[PDB]
Write a protein that binds this ligand. Sequence first.
Ligand code: CU
Ligand code: CU
Ligand code: NA
Ligand code: NA
Lengths: 618, 618
Amino acid sequence: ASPFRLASAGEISEVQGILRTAGLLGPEKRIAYLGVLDPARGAGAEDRRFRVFIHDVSGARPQEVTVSVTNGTVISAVELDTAATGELPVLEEEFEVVEQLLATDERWLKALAARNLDVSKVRVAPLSAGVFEYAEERGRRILRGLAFVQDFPEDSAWAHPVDGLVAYVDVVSKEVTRVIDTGVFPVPAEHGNYTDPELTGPLRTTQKPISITQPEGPSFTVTGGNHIEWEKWSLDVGFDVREGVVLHNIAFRDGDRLRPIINRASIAEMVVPYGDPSPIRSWQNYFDTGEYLVGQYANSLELGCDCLGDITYLSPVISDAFGNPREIRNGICMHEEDWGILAKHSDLWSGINYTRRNRRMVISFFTTIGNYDYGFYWYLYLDGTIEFEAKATGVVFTSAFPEGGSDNISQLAPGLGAPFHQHIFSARLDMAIDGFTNRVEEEDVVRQTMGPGNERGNAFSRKRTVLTRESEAVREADARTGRTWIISNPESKNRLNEPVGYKLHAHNQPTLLADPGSSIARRAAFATKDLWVTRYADDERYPTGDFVNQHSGGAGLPSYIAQDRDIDGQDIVVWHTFGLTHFPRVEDWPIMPVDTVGFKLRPEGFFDRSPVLDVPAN
Amino acid sequence: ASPFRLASAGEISEVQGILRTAGLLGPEKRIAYLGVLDPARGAGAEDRRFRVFIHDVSGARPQEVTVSVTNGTVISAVELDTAATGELPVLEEEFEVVEQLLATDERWLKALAARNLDVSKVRVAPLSAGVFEYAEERGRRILRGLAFVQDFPEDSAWAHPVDGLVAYVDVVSKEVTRVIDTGVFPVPAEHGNYTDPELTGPLRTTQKPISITQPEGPSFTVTGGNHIEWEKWSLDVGFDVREGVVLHNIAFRDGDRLRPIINRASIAEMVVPYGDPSPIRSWQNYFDTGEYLVGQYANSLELGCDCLGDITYLSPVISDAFGNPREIRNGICMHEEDWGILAKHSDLWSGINYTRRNRRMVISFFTTIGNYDYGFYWYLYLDGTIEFEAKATGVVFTSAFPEGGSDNISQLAPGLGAPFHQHIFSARLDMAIDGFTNRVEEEDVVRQTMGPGNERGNAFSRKRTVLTRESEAVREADARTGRTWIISNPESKNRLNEPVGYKLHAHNQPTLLADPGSSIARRAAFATKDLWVTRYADDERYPTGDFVNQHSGGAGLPSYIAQDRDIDGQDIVVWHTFGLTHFPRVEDWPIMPVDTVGFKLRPEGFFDRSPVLDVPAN
Ligand SMILES: [Cu+2]
Ligand SMILES: [Cu+2]
Ligand code: NA
Ligand code: NA
């Protein structure tokens, strides 16, 4: 029975039972985070452990707690000084509180009355507060509110932002701390109702069906709930409330032996920094993963439209605020799809014409964080390639469009603006290239001068620089010189006596644009550089640390690498920053078509020849 | 009847008839190139014209000839000084000549005898000669030969390169001009026969079928032979023996009006420079498009494995060496395919959950140039996006692997090497954004310093620089600052009073690595920079000029832009360089899995809101 299996409803209840029995889950206690821990290095006696962050609604300090569900014990339980180490993740029950409190606040009511807005119609987005100049906030759970008018129950409030107005609220003490009204801006009037026949026009009747079926079922097998076997690949599909879909034990069956490639793959953080210097939004940065927990808002995916073809679903189970299990029904899609030509050659000399088709295994989920929706897709290809893709859609976050324009906002509709922002991901790749003794090299293309040894000036080459210690493993992209990073195992050689390896190909999109002195440059330090390599430690899980909410700099990647540990042939972890810089366009409105970003890794001398020679003709 | 329709078998015969009748196609004459010309600006009285390059096997000078097939006349016919303006494209009948001549040459036979190679088993690759230090070559049709051993009729000769040996041959006079033997290298012995059960092992039985059907047929219509209508898109699919699939009249039906986007889209050149400084290969650069004509080697694509699903094929017709028509049966695939989620949002406030699926129209062909095979794919998406993708596969070009290694060659198998090289494309995009009055801006992300106006240091912006004249329109990539280029129409404004536009997103791969003083840097000047913009002229068709074969610098892009013409609101042409830098890997051997490169253009304020609001639920 696999120690990487998904959490069951029964294990969550049992964690609830253990915490209760131990006096840790009283009626004022709320579970802000609950996840199964990964087995320790060299673990394979089953010991299923769970980590829990417990919040207290009476204002008592929260606790970080580690439970062992196999033995029914509490391993550890420590009280957190949230002013030092960070507030716990935002709770779903707090979302509604910001609006609720504000409705009876004289300063808010006065703001709304000045704009002739009915309070019953004003929705309020509960946004993370971050850390800025407000000393009273240190140690308190604050959310900031931005207002959107909803004309009727099924109206898109995003069409009607209320600019010039923002409020700060304490969700534990249930007080409004501040209401800032910098002045009235017109509230945009056009609606953004993309199911309304008057905006859509008559729907298209021209789309004929595309049917994708597998009459013998899929080529992959699921065993033990979440262990996948597919075209030589094997892995375990995990799910965590914070990270979402996590991949464990990525390995490839090369002949007789199962060869490990990646021990653990996840999206360990994502940040959405806004680039509008208005005080109404200049504080706005979302850590969807770290502050909000993208996994808990995973959608239930419907058949025939979210995932198309012969789909196998997992329904991962998470804890609600009280420790009861709730299943995200059909939260994870798994299927295989055709991927065009894999390899082809029509040889004149031999007379042999050869064509083989490609395919990929797809493991995905989709999450919704207020106006934003994100699809997270992992792909495994026949040829050994591993890819991640993020798909960004939803409704763009809106503001007023100033009269006379803006260098930091674009116009979507009359008076309607969309502040510039980025969406930036950190992929945490706990490498295991033919096992754990790994090293990373930076590879650049090398141009050569015409002269002795190169008289026609056609030569070009490449170079590789080993990253030997964490202090020299914070790297930036260089698209111009074709920079990639190769993860190799210096003690496992292919038949040509070269170290086996995988090469990471980035998209070389811009990294974090904020000024390096900014609060966000410190809280999202990871996002300022494209590639980090650390020595593995079981407590270095996120590039932003364990508690991101209103937590200043001081944890996460920059503190991990300060240890300057040896990474030249050790158990190492690759953290790749990648993101989209979004200047919104009128085509993004009223609902945004998908835009994508990602990366991939391809074998680099890993195999002894092509690993797809045994793929049959179609 | 459409003036952009494909050439018919009858038109080619009739060109043959006109040339014959006019005394231009005698029995010593050979057609090296024949294609239909595009209508002139403002043409829509039908005048189908054809351009022809006629070679003479008796050593007489070739002719460039323009014929009008509608009227049955010769419009023009001029004699070429090939030493000045370039040799004609390599003829298919010349491929075999290099081996044939060399078989009875004492210097070649002596080279082969020194290596104990049987001449009956030595295949010779007829490679373009380019232009280097050999004065006798100027004005003569030369090919260079590199030798590969084929052990039996169905062996892969590429496995057995004969290094240290190269020969130069005149295919008109039928003489061997030179044989260079720099010394024996071991001939690699392992075979590269990817259909041999001993190399493949038992074939996989694990792949279950994927069936892609359309029970009502496809959503696109074909009329007039090659006019496509699909989900608001309309275009004409052309085919030229040099460029292959060319797209004409790309337009989008936005409500009532058919809005042009791109007038003509093609791959106007592709170059494959080799980076091994050995004199055996340092001359090696292939212009697949310009020297060899990729269209004439287009494969016949088989159903259920080259193109999968409900496919509509075109079978374009080309001229053979004598002016007879030959059809490339099923040479062009056209189909539509699913492309995941198009847009999605689950709104808390409204309670509305919304999901729409994407799809794309695919127009492709596949060509084979000796060891290389390339797939050329154009995609049209529901949301207005236009994409090109090149898929590179085939067998890698081989050499010996030196003992003691190499900075310019990688090892694939014992003693077997693969010289470093690039594959670089030029896409020629004759822009028509809402018509022909267009302009191009370079857009960079702009970082802002924390200070007055930006006290939190979160602001970021962008800037756009109009490229006003050809002298300032030769641009390079800058991935770090998110550089793109926007093609706009300054006189067509969207509802927000902004110029309509499309944004070109490049991959920012390395451009030509050869030393700027190199012969290849001059012949492939286009490849040294990522983006060029020229004022349209009907005679500026290729970035390398009309005659690339053994033609030095002096034509193509650098000479076009010297005219320094106005491109600020004019009929303009975008030439985008993009390519792959290939350091071959053991996984590429014995047959290479597909690797991809490309680009795309997305609407940028072109539409008044999302153009896919009328897409129905699934
Ligand atoms: Cu965005
Ligand atoms: Cu290549
Ligand atoms: Na590791
Ligand atoms: Na144009």
